[PDB]
């Protein structure tokens, strides 16, 4: 769809990235 | 397929073929006897006549030439001869 | 440095008596300042008016040119000048697998309005026809063109522009050609696509009163 293509080209992608960084007894 | 007696064709294929492509060629034309409705005389007319043929006594128009067979006048009667 | 539209004033323009709706609108004309008179600038104005703006239930794809040449004290007075079809109708009406036949005549009427007709017709596909293309041969085209010439020539010439205009209102000429010409090749969309006005006689005022009321 042309509306979807224009809106997605004018917006920013976000979301997916999983970064792995980093008592009872 | 690939097997048919060319010597003895059934009459519908021979009638269907072009007149020169028949096994022994024969014309599609014929001679016909016409009677004028205004009289009783009989006239022999070619089916594919190219000239206008007039009555010997009535002098009426019997047949009109067209591209193929002649156009007989509405009223004239005809019977195929032989 | 000063606005000209305060100097301007309005006139009201009415339609002739053939037409159900007579209010065809207003006109913005300069007042007379002694140099030029408003009438002389108002005695020649052509109006391209749709038919649906003239009658309530008529179609809109036929347009009439009406020429205003008289003023009557904030009352513009018009007369017939021509007729034409809309461009979208003319474009959609020429489709492909068919033949178009178009003809024209120059003809004189009963009251001096020498005028020209252009009419168009299209070959029609039959209801049981499986052939894609419905083309007429050249001799059929000539015979059809002849027949529409005599039909439109006879049913314009013997009448007056009252009866000519009321024939052009439902386009009885086109449907009559369609009815009388269907025996050579059946036709599809027969209309008088254009009427010109080649010549006019001297202006008379009583006939405008007959044309209006």
């Amino acid at each position: 769809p042309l509306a979807d293509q224009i809106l997605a080209g004018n917006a920013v992608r976000a979301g997916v990235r999983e970064k792995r960084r980093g008592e009872e007894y | 397929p690939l097997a048919k007696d060319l010597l003895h064709p059934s009459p519908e294929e021979e009638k269907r073929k072009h007149k020169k492509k028949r096994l022994v060629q024969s014309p599609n034309s014929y001679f016909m006897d016409v009677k004028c409705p205004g009289c009783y005389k009989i006239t022999t007319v070619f089916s594919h006549a190219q000239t206008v043929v007039l009555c010997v006594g009535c002098s009426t128009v019997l047949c009109q030439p067209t591209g193929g067979k002649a156009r007989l006048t509405e009223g004239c009667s005809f019977r195929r001869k032989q | 440095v000063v606005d000209p539209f305060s100097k301007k004033d309005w006139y009201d323009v009415k339609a002739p008596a053939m037409f159900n709706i007579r209010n065809i609108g207003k006109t913005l004309v300069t007042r007379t300042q002694g140099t030029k008179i408003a009438s002389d600038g108002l005695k020649g104005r052509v109006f391209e008016v749709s038919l649906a703006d003239l009658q309530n239930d008529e179609v809109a794809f036929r347009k009439f040119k009406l020429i205003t040449e008289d003023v009557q004290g904030k009352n513009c007075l018009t007369n017939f000048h021509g007729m034409d079809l809309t461009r979208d109708k003319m474009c959609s009406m020429v489709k492909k697998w068919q033949t178009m036949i178009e003809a024209h005549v120059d003809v004189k009427t009963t009251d001096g309005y020498l005028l020209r007709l252009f009419c168009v017709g299209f070959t029609k596909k039959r209801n049981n026809q499986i052939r894609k293309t419905s083309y007429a041969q050249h001799q059929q085209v000539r015979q059809i063109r002849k027949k529409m010439m005599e039909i439109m020539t006879r049913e314009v010439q013997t009448n007056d522009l009252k009866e000519v205009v009321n024939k052009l209102i439902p386009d009885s000429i086109g449907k009559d050609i369609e009815k009388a010409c269907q025996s050579i090749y059946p036709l599809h969309d027969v209309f008088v696509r254009k009427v010109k006005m080649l010549k006019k006689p001297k202006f008379e005022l009583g006939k405008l009163m007959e044309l209006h009321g």
């Binding site: - | - | 309005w10 913005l28 004309v29 104005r45 809109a60």
Partner: protein, 135 residues
């Protein structure tokens, strides 16, 4: 100021929207076409040759002519589109559609759309050669 017409009935005009490939003209006339009300080109709205044929210049032009005709008192217009015609292209550009939608955006009542561009029956040789296109 304006026509002496009651509140129920509107007053009609017509609008020549001439959308050439270099600019766009907005000419408003009465039903005759002889007398002029307004005409606003894409050059008078932008002080730049970039946007002379832009949809933006035509939009500003249509807003300007709509507010000026409402100032004068014309409440309804017929619409007559036109392209450059003749040997060249016959279809109106985006400037014409921009001007049309912009003057309809002002709340002003729109009439009937007629697209009468000078389509030739047959015409003479075109401006380019045997070789050259736009680009």
């Amino acid at each position: 100021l304006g026509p002496q017409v009651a509140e129920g009935e509107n007053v009609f005009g017509v609008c020549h929207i001439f959308a050439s490939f270099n600019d766009t003209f907005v000419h408003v006339t009465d039903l005759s076409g002889k007398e002029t009300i307004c005409r606003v080109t894409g050059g008078m709205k932008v002080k730049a040759d970039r946007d002379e044929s832009s949809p933006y210049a035509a939009m500003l032009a249509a807003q300007d002519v709509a507010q000026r005709c409402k100032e004068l008192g014309i409440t309804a217009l017929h619409i007559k589109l036109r392209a450059t015609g003749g040997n060249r292209t016959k279809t109106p550009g985006p400037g014409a559609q921009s001007a049309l939608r912009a003057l309809a955006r002002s709340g002003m009542k729109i009439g009937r759309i007629e697209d009468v561009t000078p389509i030739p029956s047959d015409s003479t040789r075109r401006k380019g050669g045997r070789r050259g296109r736009r680009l």
